[model samples]
Target: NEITVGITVTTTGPAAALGIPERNALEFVAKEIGGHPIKMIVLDDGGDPTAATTNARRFVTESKADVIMGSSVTPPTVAVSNVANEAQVPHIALAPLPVTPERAKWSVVMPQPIPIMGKVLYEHMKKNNIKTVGYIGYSDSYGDLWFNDLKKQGEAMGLKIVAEERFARPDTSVAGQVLKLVAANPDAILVGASGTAAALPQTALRERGYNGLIYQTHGAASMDFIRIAGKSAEGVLMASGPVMDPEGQNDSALTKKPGLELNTAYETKYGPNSRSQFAGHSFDAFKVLERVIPVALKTAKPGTQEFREAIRKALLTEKDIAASQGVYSFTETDRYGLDDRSRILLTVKNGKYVIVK
Candidate 1:
């Protein structure tokens, strides 16, 4: 029996920059797992929650997907997770989601959780002697996650959050928010948005003449950010997964080889410097499946409730599975199983993301 994997991603709208590469990377994922042929059905959610829910439902009722993956950004990913949990299908989430009881049972996140990524950012701020911070993020779940993480972790580290502001994903201007942040005069600013939209705060802050250090989350670690933000992007720091600069990792690091391989394959097909962190999440999901699917296959055949249950169990029990992004080791309580190995600090220097040493 063939394993059916259904994926829904926001391949259009505001998040297209993140989703298009993720969708494109799917073409390079393994076509078979553990001697069983795999069938993949992909749909575009256009960054809509309604569309993501519809796609996940279709995967459950119509496609009978043994496993479901993605809806690139956070809000849509949560929508798909709701359906996957109800359907009792194994879900591999590309974005970080809140780990509720139902989500912990069915879905495992691919991206590093906000706390893990946030720790890296805060540590960098501490090292750089940044005392106060200003935050501008989306008015959505993604923003809330970063905001709450920063509040909890930043304050604990003695870093004051001087200002907090947010905007909708599609909003053209954040003049008011930037003005307020500038007036607050924080030593650094963090933008909790993704894709090209993440560039808005950076460009606005620079244009507003607030030249302090600017930080971004992993969601904005794509070439489009550099291209869109132009000169303002230079010297901006980011918390990123190791995939952003695999070659920069020590030779002994487990993720370096596979991360470089993914970069080579993606860049070969797309163009020079076209690798994306979101695409790395998409690739790592398949890598995880490659490790666990065979374990599930031993218990039951694909498309059966037994098989889905086995897959879910396998995900929780699996340990130290190496992939492009980092090593994964999921537990019943932790869906996003990446640790310090998965995170790296990045800075845009001369139109490229470089390891912040």
Candidate 2:
């Protein structure tokens, strides 16, 4: 069908974990879709902004891909989006990703907006009567995106934004950032980066005798966060997509009812503990595309625009969509498919994360 889709995915950069996981998930889905091969032209973003933009543009202009998606991290997508915009290609973007007023109008968005997380977390906290929060994240775009949304969420829920601080990526002095938030005497602290960067704030905060609640964004939702935070990770409530707590357990079967089989397949192909936001979302994106690509193909008039909007419309209405183990569906208004419904509300009661929901 000469129908090509360019994936400006991150594979070797700081955000490789996310990109890699995404690739794995999509590959799993690809394995399932034996026929109807969608020529996937993947370009590694390497988590670099300029390179990301260049790759995004090249696929559209030079390679002439029918569709494009990109840059697992936010900064890279900032440039990636401009490239898509300039090329006039429809993108189911997964990066520089946010579902905010300022950025929502982007030609496309994947994985929901970062700020809405603040809103969801705030709602959960309010339901539990938690009133104070200390926030920690990279001073970079990821941190800013979440912190800004957190501020809005905190205000609406009447939860106080007690303290806010920034940390450098890979900075060993993360404890100092913890101290800043701990000093505010907040009920909890929020970590906004993906697991590699966000989990340490717990150790820093706990050592300072500040025990209230620990909050984290979807970025920190992986088991890697639990591993890094370890004992410190206990009792921390993280807001994230709906994922199976462990192998073979299915409490929520709304979107995708993941079971042990999927985990087995994942660990069988990749190591038992190798995953990232990348593989998970990439898997879902591919499935969404796979399910609806047929509809897109039917409408494809050949030698015209690829009926990208028709595909998007199909994706928007797909109901009870299933993947690996979680169950999710999409609607035009509910772009963030996994909110509280998919979240685990994980708490470290003992040495392991126990799902509260």
Candidate 3:
């Protein structure tokens, strides 16, 4: 039997910095899983929700994919989630998404959830005696998720959000938002954006002369951010998954071996300093498939509703499956099956991410 996997990611838009690497990493996935041949169909959503839905619909109808994986950014990922739920196919989302009861049934998020990443950020702030924070992020779901988490968690941790701002993903400038944030003059600024676009607020803040401290979410955890933001990115700290700087992980950490494996394969192909958290998500999705596909195959062959249902069940029940990003232990109640082991703190130093130490 052949298992077909369909993937739609933002490989040609503002978020392409993320999706390109994710697409690149797909080539590294196993061609066969559990004695069955694996066929993959890849599509580009260009970070558009409509495009993502259309791609997912094609996967459901034309390709009859047994499983679907997704657009690299949150908005498009949510679009793919809806289609996957309607079609009853298991979806492994590359971006962080809000879990609803309906989505939890068909989808599992690959990236660390906003709160999990945010907790690391808040802890770093508390450790460094940061009191007030200014927020600037995308004007969409990704932005809302981060902002909500920062407010709820930051306040509880005694880190006040002094100002908040928003921008569209395609926007070329954040002058107004940066000005407002600089005026607030908080102890630190957190850019909730992702991909290369995440560098916008950082560059804008530096140019506008706000130079206290800057922080970023895992969304900006790519070298592309440093490339785009230039020197402005230096000294910025960000919350990241273990995959970003896996060399820094403790030698005994469960995620270390796989993380190094992915980093080696990816960096070898794409060159040094090319590791991507987004690519890690794509690779890890397949790692999950490697574990569960055998169990699903026991019940039903691929390309059928039974097979898809079987795959979903296996995903929910699988426990302690290790991957480059973290160990996953899914449950019916949790679509994002990651813990503290999944997160790390990194700073942009000398044009690359380094462990905070």
Candidate 4:
């Protein structure tokens, strides 16, 4: 029998660029994961949390999805994952979310979690001699996650968190926030925003003449950020997945293998400079499924409750997976399958992202 894999995404929202690439990756990964033809049911939630929840229920009840992947942003992904949990379905979230140990057993995420990204950012800070850093981010779950992780990781690494402020995604101006960051006068600044929307803070900071070093999170890895920020993005550093620095990945044994395969396919299909960490994240999700589904099949068939549990159990046993993002080693306690290889320091130069080596 074919396996039904359900996907929910905000493909038509304000952050459509982020979800569109992920949706493309899923289409690229369709066909088979483990000798079983896949029935992929994708629904657009239009960036609405309620719609995401509705899509989750529909996938479980009507589509009988054995596994579910979902609703691009953190809020929507959280909504979908909770619904999947209630239905006892294995869920693969495209966003990096803060999941409890209880939820970790059944749900795994594609993106590197905030804490992992924080460690990477801290390493970059150490190398660059950054001591104090200011922050401006969305006043939402995404911002909260990054903010919490940054404070925890920064203080431990001797990097002081000098200032912090938040803004709504729909806000027209973050100049007020940027002004405060300038007043705090840290050695560097980390913007906890995502997508092209992140450009608001970057532009505001630059226009405000805050000359300190600026850093962005992997959430802003899309070309849309560059397109929107223009020259303001130049020289800004970031912590990103291997996809952002494809050439730099060739030296790492963990990232080299999968990075080559992913870049070839993505560039071939989408053209040069089109590969993104968001798209690679979705690719990694399929890669994990491909490896785990066969192991799961040994215990039960798709569409059955037993099959979902089998998939979840097999996922925990994964070790040393060469995902495009990094080497993934999942465990019963942790579902984020990324390590040091996944973190790369990047800078935008001459209108392109390059490793800051």
* Global lDDT of each candidate: 0.91, 0.65, 0.90, 0.83
In model 2, state the lDDT of residue 137.
87
lDDT of 2 by residue, 176-266 (tens): 6766776688876778887466667777777778778778877775667777777888777776554444442445554444434445567
- RMSD per candidate (Å) reads 0.8, 3.4, 1.0, 1.6
lDDT tens readout by residue for model 1, 237-311: 899888888878899999998899899999998898888888899899999999999999888999899999999
Q: Candidate 3, which ten residues in sequence have the lowest lDDT sum?
A: 348-357
What are the runs in model 1 whose C-alpha is more than 4 Å off? Answer: none
Residue 24 CA displacement from its true place in model 1, Å: 0.5
Question: Model 2 off-target regions past 4 Å?
Answer: 31-35, 99-107, 127-129, 170-172, 246-252, 258-262, 273-277, 301-304, 312-340, 349-351
Ranked candidates, highest TM-score first: 1, 3, 4, 2
Q: List the residue pairs that clash in candidate 4.
A: 8-71
TM-score of candidate 2 against the unseen true structure: 0.83
* Tens-place lDDT digits, model 4, residues 1-357: 999999898788666877888888765674776788999888888768899999999999999999999777888888888888789999989887778755676788878888877787778888888999998988888999999988888898899998999998768798788778999999989898788778888888988888888889888887888889999999988878887666665564667766677777877898888888888888888888888899999889988999999988888786777788877888776778677777777889988987876
Candidate 2 vs 4: which has more TM-score: 4
lDDT of residue 224 for candidate 3: 86
In candidate 3, stretches whose alpha carbon ends up further than 4 angstroms from where it belongs are: none
User: Which 10 successive residues of model 2 have the least lDDT summed?
Assistant: 98-107
